[PDB]
Design a protein around this ligand. Structure first.
Ligand SMILES: Nc1ncnc2c1ncn2[C@@H]1O[C@H](COP(=O)(O)OP(=O)(O)OP(=O)(O)O)[C@@H](O)[C@H]1O
Ligand SMILES: Nc1ncnc2c1ncn2[C@@H]1O[C@H](COP(=O)(O)OP(=O)(O)OP(=O)(O)O)[C@@H](O)[C@H]1O
Ligand SMILES: Nc1ncnc2c1ncn2[C@@H]1O[C@H](COP(=O)(O)O)[C@@H](O)[C@H]1O
Ligand SMILES: [Mg+2]
Ligand SMILES: [Mg+2]
Lengths: 304, 73, 102
């Protein structure tokens, strides 16, 4: 278990090796209208976009769905108090509104840096998007994510000199979160879910019934769908109605149990191509959550 | 000692060269959203509602990335 | 993002187009070389980073009435801070276009 096939693997592979042969990348000039910028994420089918400051001639940060959620939450509350600035903000001006005195520089990684360094930067900076930037040209090559990193790990270590801990359970490794679980109900208004997203900083919410059994899941991704409509005002509707608008059909929420081996969970997560499993009991009542961050944090501080 | 005469080439650069070597004029990426010498070339979407969308594909070693810039006018 | 167009198109006279890009280059303090009457190599010193960027302009005929100006970037040889060759290329283009077209 100790030192691990994973830790050595990560120290001995470059970030470059995870980049697909061909990818698209969306860049926003910081003078761009916030509204247009979020419409571009949807249009391009993309989660995050580097920010380019033209005056300074460099990347200065990222625009993610979290920023979008933050902005919608502020817009919603501001409207009730007759303040309508938000929508005409340029990226520049919103960043100045929130990155106030407290500075958060762009974190990025060289294509020649270890995958270990990439995993450590995501955990330590509490971040889901790590732009891979070539120090020779200055180009962003690619945006690295937990999902990609885990998939790569599952695939290229497929072969088992297997660490004992792969055959150990979530319970005994203590991977995941089992208390203070943020969740909503069938009827919870979308805006109420926003407030929860903002206050708890959590990527998804299990949707539960009256006995707290999980029947759906409401993600941050399910939130840029609100950038499809030519209105923005439909935030008072229930979470159930909000999810009806999903793209593709839906084979139920992807779940797991506390007593499943880590190996079983990694495989489910990797092949389902999703950010987390909802941890459930015999009766589908939610007992916790296991996210990609949980796993990558486990795999890097040496399993469990 | 005679004067000298100039026979001047002209044309060849009469009209500008016609396009298709193998370089595509238009790229439809509908999709419900592998090509050669279009690398490094500028592409754009029509200007819509005061925004410029510039794009090109570049190569880092064996990897290709298509970069889009959204930029106001 | 559905329909992509290579470069920009114009029904202005070829000689006008090339003359106007040249005036645009000079106005912008870019430096240039005329390879052909329809082919220009251009170079730019970055007023912030002090780095240099090079690109190519080529004019093509696409109709009896219509032409196409084509831009090609030219290759060289933890906080990011100044520079991105790809983004700087887009800005050169954008500048060139704004300062001579439409
Ligand atoms: N690489 C980065 N460097 C600096 N700041 C970043 C970086 N990535 C994201 N941020 C900022 O930090 C915050 C964290 O957001 P995050 O990246 O987790 O959004 P997200 O990846 O879409 O969320 P989630 O993964 O839950 O869907 C955002 O405000 C974002 O603007
Ligand atoms: N445990 C789950 N079970 C079923 N569906 C899920 C689950 N988690 C997320 N989804 C759904 O999958 C879609 C994509 O969500 P997810 O957050 O996994 O995508 P993503 O933002 O690209 O992931 P990541 O941030 O890891 O790259 C969403 O519409 C969401 O409702
Ligand atoms: N709805 C939720 N309630 C409580 N914790 C969560 C929830 N979603 C994710 N987490 C946990 O919070 C951390 C961030 O996960 P994520 O935001 O999904 O990458 C991980 O440790 C998760 O286990
Ligand atoms: Mg997101
Ligand atoms: Mg993703």
């Amino acid at each position: 278990s100790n030192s691990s096939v994973y830790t050595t693997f990560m120290k001995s592979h470059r970030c470059y090796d995870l980049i697909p042969t061909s990818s698209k990348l969306v860049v926003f000039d910081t003078s761009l209208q916030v509204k247009k910028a979020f419409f571009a994420l949807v249009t391009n089918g993309v989660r995050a976009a580097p920010l380019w400051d033209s005056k300074k001639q460099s990347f200065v940060g990222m625009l993610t769905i979290t920023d979008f959620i933050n902005i919608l939450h502020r817009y919603y509350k501001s409207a009730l108090v007759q303040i309508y600035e938000l929508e005409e903000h340029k990226i520049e001006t919103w960043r100045e509104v929130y990155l106030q005195d407290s500075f958060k520089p762009l974190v990025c990684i060289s294509p020649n840096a270890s995958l270990f360094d990439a995993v450590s930067s995501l955990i330590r900076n509490k971040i889901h998007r790590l732009p891979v930037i070539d120090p020779e040209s200055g180009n962003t090559l690619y945006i690295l994510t937990h999902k990609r990193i885990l998939k790569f790990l599952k695939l290229f270590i497929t072969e088992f000199p297997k660490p004992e801990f792969m055959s150990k359970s979530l319970e005994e490794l203590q991977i995941g979160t089992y208390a203070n679980i943020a969740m909503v109900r069938t009827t919870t208004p979308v805006y109420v879910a926003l407030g929860i997203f903002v206050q708890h900083r959590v990527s998804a919410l299990p949707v539960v019934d009256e006995k707290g059994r999980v029947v759906d899941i409401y993600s941050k991704f399910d939130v840029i769908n609100l950038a499809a409509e030519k209105t923005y005002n439909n935030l008072d509707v229930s979470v159930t109605k909000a999810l009806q608008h999903r793209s593709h059909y839906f084979e139920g929420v992807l779940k797991c149990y506390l007593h499943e081996t880590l190996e079983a969970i990694i495989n489910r997560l990797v092949e389902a191509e999703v950010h987390r499993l909802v941890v459930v009991d015999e009766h589908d009542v939610v007992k916790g959550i296991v996210s990609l961050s949980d796993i990558l944090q486990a795999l890097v501080l040496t399993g469990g | 000692g005679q004067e000298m005469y100039a026979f001047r080439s002209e044309e060849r650069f009469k009209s500008p060269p016609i396009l298709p070597p193998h370089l595509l004029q238009v790229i439809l990426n509908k999709d419900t959203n592998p090509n050669h010498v279009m690398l490094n070339h500028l592409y754009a979407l029509s200007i819509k509602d005061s925004v410029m969308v510039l794009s090109a594909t570049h190569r880092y070693k064996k990897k290709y990335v298509t970069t889009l810039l959204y930029k106001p006018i | 993002s559905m329909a992509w167009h290579l470069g920009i198109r114009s029904q202005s006279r070829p000689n006008d187009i090339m003359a106007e890009v040249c005036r645009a280059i000079k106005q912008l303090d870019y430096e240039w070389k005329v390879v052909n009457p329809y082919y220009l190599r251009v170079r730019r010193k970055n007023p912030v980073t002090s780095t240099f960027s090079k690109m190519s302009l080529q004019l093509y005929q696409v109709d009896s009435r219509t032409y196409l100006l084509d831009f090609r970037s030219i290759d060289d040889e933890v906080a990011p801070r100044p520079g991105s060759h790809t983004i700087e290329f887009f800005e050169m283009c954008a500048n060139l276009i704004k300062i001579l077209a439409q």
